[PDB]
Amino acid sequence: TEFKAGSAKKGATLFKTRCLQCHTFDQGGANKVGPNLHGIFGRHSGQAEGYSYTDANIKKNVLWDENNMSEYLTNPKKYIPGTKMAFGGLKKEKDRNDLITYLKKACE
Amino acid sequence: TEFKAGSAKKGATLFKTRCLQCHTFDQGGANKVGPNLHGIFGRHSGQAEGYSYTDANIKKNVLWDENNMSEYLTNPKKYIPGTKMAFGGLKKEKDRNDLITYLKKACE
Ligand code: HEM
Numbered sequence: 642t643e644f645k646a647g648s649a650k651k652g653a654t655l656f657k658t659r660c661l662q663c664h665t666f667d668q669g670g671a672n673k674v675g676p677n678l679h680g681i682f683g684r685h686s687g688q689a690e691g692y693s694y695t696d697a698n699i700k701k702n703v704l705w706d707e708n709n710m711s712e713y714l715t716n717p718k719k720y721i722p723g724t725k726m727a728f729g730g731l732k733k734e735k736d737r738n739d740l741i742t743y744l745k746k747a748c749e
Numbered sequence: 750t751e752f753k754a755g756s757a758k759k760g761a762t763l764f765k766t767r768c769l770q771c772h773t774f775d776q777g778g779a780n781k782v783g784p785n786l787h788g789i790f791g792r793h794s795g796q797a798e799g800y801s802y803t804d805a806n807i808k809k810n811v812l813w814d815e816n817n818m819s820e821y822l823t824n825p826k827k828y829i830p831g832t833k834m835a836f837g838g839l840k841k842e843k844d845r846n847d848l849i850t851y852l853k854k855a856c857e
Pocket residue numbers: 656659660661662663664674675676681685686687688689693694695696697698714723724725726727728731
């Protein structure tokens with residue numbers, strides 16, 4: 642695990658294009674198919690208020706940081722087997738760096 | 750040649766990230782390393798006012814459309830051998846569709 646800073650501009654459009662369909666990142670943002678991601682960095686998995694996670698997510702108790710996030714986004718079901726997140730993953734590291742750069746400034 | 754509509758949102762960040770370094774797309778936009786692209790679609794190659802093209806660009810007399818543009822962006826030097834445009838190309842069609850979707854609404 643070794644993430645590098647990418648384009649937030651580029652990361653924000655990855656977000657709109659691959660994650661918005663199921664999540665919000667804003668404070669005061671609502672849970673939708675996926676939980677609201679505001680303040681995810683440094684939190685553990687399964688703790689968004691009012692959201693119904695899988696036993697799988699909960700139990701993994703992942704601490705969310707930028708390198709976890711990157712391994713996570715590679716192949717979600719592989720990272721947390723039993724997850725309901727129906728996303729196949731961001732194959733290219735460059736894509737992942739971008740998206741995690743934006744999430745890092747946007748979810749805070 | 751068969752281009753399909755992509756994300757303009759996504760195409761605009763490709764632009765910022767791969768083309769802005771050398772071009773503008775705005776009307777009233779200045780020539781920089783590369784010529785200003787405002788109104789490129791339907792024009793022929795080598796005709797931006799006040800810009801010093803290569804003999805290569807000029808002579809190809811490419812008519813600029815969305816499918817030309819896409820073959821062009823794949824491998825620029827291959828499309829116009831003798832070109833000074835020091836860009837290696839957009840390998841992924843998806844990337845090219847996005848970028849040409851945005852250019853199409855932005856350069857008009
Ligand atoms: C690349 C875009 C995405 C990002 C960055 C992202 C990020 C995340 C993260 C970090 C979690 C863990 C939540 C936590 O532990 O608080 C999560 C969960 C979840 N996401 Fe995504 N996700 C993305 C795409 C999607 C998409 C497209 C969907 C809908 C098809 C989706 C649906 C879900 C669901 C249902 C959960 C909860 C899983 C469970 O409870 O087992 N996500 N997402």
